[PDB]
Every structure is written in C-alpha cells, then in structure tokens.
Amino acid sequence: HHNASTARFYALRLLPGQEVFSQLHAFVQQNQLRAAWIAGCTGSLTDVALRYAGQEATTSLTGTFEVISLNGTLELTGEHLHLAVSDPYGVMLGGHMMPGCTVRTTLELVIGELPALTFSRQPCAISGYDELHISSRL
Amino acid sequence: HHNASTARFYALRLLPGQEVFSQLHAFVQQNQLRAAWIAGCTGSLTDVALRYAGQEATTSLTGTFEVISLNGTLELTGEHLHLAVSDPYGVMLGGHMMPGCTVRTTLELVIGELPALTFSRQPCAISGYDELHISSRL
Amino acid sequence: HHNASTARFYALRLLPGQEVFSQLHAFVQQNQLRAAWIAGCTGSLTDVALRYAGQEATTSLTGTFEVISLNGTLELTGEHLHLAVSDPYGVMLGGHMMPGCTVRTTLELVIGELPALTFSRQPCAISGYDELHISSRL
Ligand SMILES: [Mg+2]
Ligand SMILES: [Mg+2]
Ligand SMILES: [Mg+2]
C-alpha cells in the first residue's frame, strides 16, 4: 500500500547563476530519489520562468525576486513544482515552475524523500494528463 | 511534554471534482491522525473558497487556479488551513481556507503526522477563540 | 558529509502580541537547535516587517493580516526566513522577514530539526554575503 513512509531529509544550497530545474534534477539523480518533495525553501532569483494557470506558454521574467515558496513533488523522471516570487514592491507572482529560473544570491532547500514509496507519473483518464501515482518502494 | 516528535508521512493525490476540505477530513479519519500538518502541496482548483483576513464572510470564486501553497494543521476534529492560489495572469489571492475548494486536474499532498503528540482546539482567554493545544499522545 | 539527516519535529503556538523573530530565536535557544527549518506555519499578524527584494530598508506595516507562508532555515546564531501575508481583500505581500512581526490571534508552527547536520552562515565569495553552510553534527 502507498501513502505511509518515514522521511529522510537533505539540506542544500544552490549558487548564484545556477538554474533551479537542472540543479534539482541533478540532486535527484545523485541521490536516486524516488519519492521526494520540497519541505522547505528560501532564496532569491534573477530570471524566473512560470507557466500561469491554464496557460500553455511559459512566461519569462528577469529582475530582482525573492523566492517566497517553492512547493511540489519530484523524483527520478518527473516532478510537479509551483513557485511564488515577490518583487521590490512586495508584489507576488505565482505559477507552475518551468526550466529557466536562475539563482540570484542563493537558494536554500530542505528536500524530503520517502524511502517506503515510489512516485511515478501515470496517465489519468479523468484529467487527461499524466498524474502522480504512489506505490510501494518494495 | 509537547512539541517534540518524529513524523510519519503520507502521500496522496486528489481527483478532479473532489472538494478539498472533505477529502482531507476523510483522510484524517481513515488514518485516525491526531497531530498532522500539510508538509507539501501542489495542484489546481476550479472553485475556491477563502475567508480573507479579519472577515466573517466566505468569498467564493470560480475559474482556473493553481495552488501555490496550502499550509496548516489538521487532526481528528479540527484544523486551521490557509490557501494561496494564482490565476492565469500570475496574480495571487490568499486567505483562510473554507469548505468549497474543488480540484481541477489534481491536488498532490504530503501530510505529516506527529505520533508522539495530539492536537486539539481549546479556548484561549487571550484571543477569545479556540486555539491550537499540543499535548502528549500518551 | 552533509545534506542527509532524519528529522525531529516540534509543534508550537505563539500568543497574541508576541513578536515572531524573538519567539523563534527563544525556541531555538531553548532546544539548542543547530539545523532547523519551518516545516509548516499558519496564523495571523497585526504588525508586519518585511524587506522587499533587493531593498535595504525594512517596510513596516500594521493592520489585519493572515500568514500564508513562512519559510526558511534557522539555527542557534542565524536564520533566513521569508514571509507572505494576505490582507482583508485577499491581496498578498511577500519579502524577507525582519524583526517586528507581531502575532494577532495566533501563530501555529511545525519546526523541523536535522540532528545529523549543523547549519552556519559563512561568507560566500560568489554572492558577497554570508550564506548557508551545511556540515555534519559530529
Ligand atoms: Mg502544476
Ligand atoms: Mg486562519
Ligand atoms: Mg532572503
């Protein structure tokens, strides 16, 4: 059965200029994470790539942003992450995170991994898209 | 004494059309969770029910929203959850989550449970409302 | 080596009128936390102190706000926390959290501690600021 598992946590800090998606995937590959999620995140970005609700196109922005929240799941060959950033006036923007977000000064992350489970993306006949599927690691 | 505990995590995915409050409570009942919190959440909503800061009335909205963050505690007979959603333009809205939020394509959740503790809602003479009370499970 | 660790969690509730930064530091000192992060948070604030993206000055606001998300790391002699609050109209504001945020009715927190690691703030030659450094507790 799924859902239940203890968690192992990882703490890491990304460097200025690094692209978030690529670094997260590299960390997942390095540790062969099969059922992870972002348990905590704080930092800053220069370039931001977001896909707004219901939209197909990716919105690319550049400036000075603070990462307010980065949430979602990730695993060996898939992920689903949402990002919220704030600007110099406190105004926020949020959406589906896409490749292209670059670290400004830092990105601090605490990533949780559920050793008893395995996440995968399987087609959902209801939504019409590949959705999160949870199964036993063993 | 309270506060300290190891955590057991649960991963689940809600389906299109399901109402969030009811599904969360069903999961709490199914697993008899006594001291849980939302450790991670990502997804989309069609209907959104929020009670804004200091307001009594619930604001009901319908459209295409992305769940940016869903935070808070929950247990057998109580909860305190806040929700932040983004729209097709990246604009965000936040408030106290109320019953009526419906899943659009999916809602992925990682819920933590603290086995050594028990959450309850007891009247606080200071705030004048029932507030979070933490005690030992044993 | 760093990054990997089990986690111990703490649940607590702050009272009306208390200042968040001071209370968080008091909790860190009381439990001698060396590598913690905010795993969950919900509540309300009256006074809010935020430093917006790229700005030096702290913006002080007072009113009726809901805490939508409080994320970041914290330890014995340092921290990095970002805050997002919503107002009576659902509008949100976000930024680097500064001392001066006061609880309105309550602030519920689940704090994670990574016993196998130790967080510190060391100068980064790349960013030019003291950044998160992760090392073994032993
Ligand atoms: Mg999404
Ligand atoms: Mg509330
Ligand atoms: Mg910051």
Side-chain angles (χ1 to χ4, degrees):
Chain A
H1 183 53
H2 44 289
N3 53 62
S5 180
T6 58
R8 187 171 65 247
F9 295 87
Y10 296 84
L12 59 152
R13 181 230 164 184
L14 302 188
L15 308 180
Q18 298 189 310
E19 191 278 319
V20 186
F21 246 70
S22 61
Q23 280 303 308
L24 285 178
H25 187 254
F27 196 80
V28 164
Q29 282 296 310
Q30 172 172 176
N31 299 101
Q32 292 293 293
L33 304 184
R34 304 301 299 290
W37 89 97
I38 309 300
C41 180
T42 185
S44 53
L45 301 173
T46 294
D47 300 312
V48 181
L50 293 172
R51 188 180 67 183
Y52 300 144
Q55 305 314 102
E56 198 69 56
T58 296
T59 301
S60 298
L61 311 173
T62 301
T64 303
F65 301 89
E66 292 296 296
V67 172
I68 295 197
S69 65
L70 171 62
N71 285 295
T73 53
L74 65 174
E75 65 280 342
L76 278 192
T77 67
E79 72 288 311
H80 189 177
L81 305 165
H82 285 180
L83 170 70
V85 295
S86 61
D87 68 19
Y89 298 101
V91 179
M92 288 172 67
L93 281 172
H96 184 71
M97 186 169 98
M98 300 295 292
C101 295
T102 61
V103 179
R104 187 151 59 75
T105 63
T106 192
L107 193 70
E108 293 170 35
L109 295 144
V110 174
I111 298 68
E113 162 76 342
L114 304 163
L117 306 170
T118 293
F119 291 167
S120 62
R121 305 291 162 170
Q122 310 291 172
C124 175
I126 311 79
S127 73
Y129 303 113
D130 297 317
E131 305 292 356
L132 180 65
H133 175 57
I134 308 82
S135 59
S136 174
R137 178 69 60 92
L138 306 178
Chain B
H1 183 53
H2 44 289
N3 53 62
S5 180
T6 58
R8 187 171 65 247
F9 295 87
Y10 296 84
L12 59 152
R13 181 230 164 184
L14 302 188
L15 308 180
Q18 298 189 310
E19 191 278 319
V20 186
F21 246 70
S22 61
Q23 280 303 308
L24 285 178
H25 187 254
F27 196 80
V28 164
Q29 282 296 310
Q30 172 172 176
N31 299 101
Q32 292 293 293
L33 304 184
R34 304 301 299 290
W37 89 97
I38 309 300
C41 180
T42 185
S44 53
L45 301 173
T46 294
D47 300 312
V48 181
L50 293 172
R51 188 180 67 183
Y52 300 144
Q55 305 314 102
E56 198 69 56
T58 296
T59 301
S60 298
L61 311 173
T62 301
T64 303
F65 301 89
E66 292 296 296
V67 172
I68 295 197
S69 65
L70 171 62
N71 285 295
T73 53
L74 65 174
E75 65 280 342
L76 278 192
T77 67
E79 72 288 311
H80 189 177
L81 305 165
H82 285 180
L83 170 70
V85 295
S86 61
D87 68 19
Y89 298 101
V91 179
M92 288 172 67
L93 281 172
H96 184 71
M97 186 169 98
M98 300 295 292
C101 295
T102 61
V103 179
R104 187 151 59 75
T105 63
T106 192
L107 193 70
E108 293 170 35
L109 295 144
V110 174
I111 298 68
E113 162 76 342
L114 304 163
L117 306 170
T118 293
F119 291 167
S120 62
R121 305 291 162 170
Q122 310 291 172
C124 175
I126 311 79
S127 73
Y129 303 113
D130 297 317
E131 305 292 356
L132 180 65
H133 175 57
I134 308 82
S135 59
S136 174
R137 178 69 60 92
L138 306 178
Chain C
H1 183 53
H2 44 289
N3 53 62
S5 180
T6 58
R8 187 171 65 247
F9 295 87
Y10 296 84
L12 59 152
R13 181 230 164 184
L14 302 188
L15 308 180
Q18 298 189 310
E19 191 278 319
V20 186
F21 246 70
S22 61
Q23 280 303 308
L24 286 178
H25 187 254
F27 196 80
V28 164
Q29 282 296 310
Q30 172 172 176
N31 298 101
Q32 292 293 293
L33 304 184
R34 304 301 299 290
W37 89 97
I38 309 300
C41 180
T42 185
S44 53
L45 301 173
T46 294
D47 300 312
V48 181
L50 293 172
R51 188 180 67 183
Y52 300 144
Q55 305 314 102
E56 198 69 56
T58 296
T59 301
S60 298
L61 311 173
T62 301
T64 303
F65 301 89
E66 292 296 296
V67 172
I68 295 197
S69 65
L70 171 62
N71 285 295
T73 53
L74 65 174
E75 65 280 342
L76 278 192
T77 67
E79 72 288 311
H80 189 177
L81 305 165
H82 285 180
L83 170 70
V85 295
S86 61
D87 68 19
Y89 298 101
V91 179
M92 288 172 67
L93 281 172
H96 184 71
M97 186 169 98
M98 300 295 292
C101 295
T102 61
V103 179
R104 187 151 59 75
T105 63
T106 192
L107 193 70
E108 293 170 35
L109 295 144
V110 174
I111 298 68
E113 162 76 342
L114 304 163
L117 306 170
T118 293
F119 291 167
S120 62
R121 305 291 162 170
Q122 310 291 172
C124 175
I126 311 79
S127 73
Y129 303 113
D130 297 317
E131 305 292 356
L132 180 65
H133 175 57
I134 308 82
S135 59
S136 174
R137 178 69 60 92
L138 306 178

